[PDB]
């Protein structure tokens, strides 16, 4: 049995790493948490610290208010019976206003108004979390790549719940808050729009979603295969190419005729993943606003 470095053989532990300071406001940084031997079999054992800050607490408060608003609706849909609650948990749904209400905020609480309230809180939670991904990198002197990639996910979410409903003329077009109901919404969306398999932006989204798993399996396996030369220390390999980076590249050059660098593979990676929701958001935004029926549209083009 050759060792494969998927799980750690010998865990080691020292003083907790408190991290870099740079321009981080240490007033808003928690203390360090405990160590998890369980996690240490696969990754780092140390938990914490975490940064709080005004945007974090606003995001947390608002995100919990979103979760609680849905929850309270679920208890009401369950007649406040805890057993009915647990039984139908995945079947409850906080639904948007009926189409008659259009984009009005006057829909009564029990027939769409609570959906709007939950959506307001979610909108605040995500966008303040986005601000947080930006400000955490900036406090550390780092590039803004995480906030920019996160924007691509936010783009699809904004299209589904906000932009497309407004362009279609009613909140009724938006996704409901429930486990099974949002799945039923997804199925219905495709049927209503003439088979989403023929939305070319949907086919691209799939190419990049499959391609993300293809690429991360490739890259994850490649870095493990060269971890015997310190391959996972990618920053110093970028600064000072080692035999790890060279063998990783030549494996792929010899296999498929071209290859990456230790830096450039992470550009391939960030675009492969970002393009999933970028093309996806375009695909959904055009559905119903421009194209009613993707299959018919495809046959005429």
């Amino acid at each position: 049995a050759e060792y494969q470095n998927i799980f750690t053989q010998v865990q080691v532990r020292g003083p907790a790493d408190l991290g870099m300071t740079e321009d981080v406001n240490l007033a808003n940084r928690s203390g360090v948490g405990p160590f998890s031997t369980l996690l240490g079999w696969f990754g780092n054992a140390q938990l914490g610290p975490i940064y709080l800050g005004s945007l974090g607490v606003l995001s947390l408060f608002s995100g919990l208010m979103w979760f609680f608003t849905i929850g309270i609706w679920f208890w009401y849909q369950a007649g406040w019976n805890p057993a009915v609650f647990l039984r139908d948990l995945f079947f409850f749904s906080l639904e948007p206003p009926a189409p008659e209400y259009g984009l009005s905020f006057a829909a009564p609480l029990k027939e769409g108004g609570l959906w709007l309230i939950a959506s307001f809180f979610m909108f605040v939670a995500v966008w303040s979390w986005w601000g947080r991904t930006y400000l955490r990198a900036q406090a550390l002197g780092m590039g803004k790549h995480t906030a920019w990639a996160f924007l691509s996910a936010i783009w699809l979410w904004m299209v589904l719940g906000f932009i497309r409903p407004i362009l279609m003329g009613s909140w009724s077009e938006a996704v409901p808050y429930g486990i099974f109901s949002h799945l039923d919404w997804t199925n219905n969306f495709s049927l209503v729009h003439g088979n989403l398999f023929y939305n070319p932006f949907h086919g691209l989204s799939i190419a990049f979603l499959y391609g993300s798993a293809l690429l991360f399996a490739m890259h994850g396996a490649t870095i493990l295969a060269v971890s015997r030369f310190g391959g996972e220390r990618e920053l110093e390999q970028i600064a000072d190419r080692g035999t790890a980076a060279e063998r990783a590249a030549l494996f792929w050059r010899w296999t498929m005729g071209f290859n990456a660098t230790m830096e450039g593979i992470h550009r391939w990676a960030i675009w492969m993943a970002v393009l999933v929701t970028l093309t996806g958001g375009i695909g959904i935004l055009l559905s119903g606003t421009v194209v009613d029926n993707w299959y018919v549209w495809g046959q005429n083009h």
Partner: protein, 281 residues
Amino acid sequence: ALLSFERKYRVPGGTLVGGNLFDFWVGPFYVGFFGVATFFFAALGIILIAWSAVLQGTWNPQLISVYPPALEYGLGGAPLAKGGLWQIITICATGAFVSWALREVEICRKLGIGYHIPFAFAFAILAYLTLVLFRPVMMGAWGYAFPYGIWTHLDWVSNTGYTYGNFHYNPAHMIAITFFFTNALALALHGALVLSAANPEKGKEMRTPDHEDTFFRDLVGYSIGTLGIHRLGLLLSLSAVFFSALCMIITGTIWFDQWVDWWQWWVKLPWWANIPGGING
């Protein structure tokens, strides 16, 4: 031509079959016995696709479609024009893919690196073999496999899914999707993290791995670590494909109803099935 650092790695050795007979390169590509095998399987498969396109009457790659035998052929062979070509092409594709993986193993050995990559690729091959071999054999007919056409295999996914109602309710399918989404989330985050450390703010020195750990700890309270994230990406992508193969190998073999029935066990548990109210009462 070589990369500037490549010559020192182009030594003899590492082959599994043939000794040094195939131990050479064509431009950047390594050959090896399984490179030759790959070429033979792929070239023949492509020739038989061209043959099937000639019989079909189209050179349009968006219309060419190689269909498996009608279900009535069961697991038997079929005439070339009526499923046989699909059958031989499937053998050629399996041969090319397995030859590809074993070629990678020879490349792994010449370069002295671990075998993680062809091992990972083997999961994709097993997912392909689930759809065209393992599931059709267990269902009793090649005709349950998917056709080889750009749009027609999408119609196959649609037809197969809706045979079971909304295929979303397949629970192994739910797990696979969760791994697919989480993998893309992890890939986006990992690419962003490295690039944000290597390309810091203007006016800054290149960051260190400690900045990456600190960023992710500040953000969510945990940093999995540079080794951990590559293990994680490999596990997420492989698990997505494992649960994909699992969600299909059970569909039509040990599960035949609308998938939305599976969860209805939870619904009609005797102690709360008949409580008036809610959704399931």
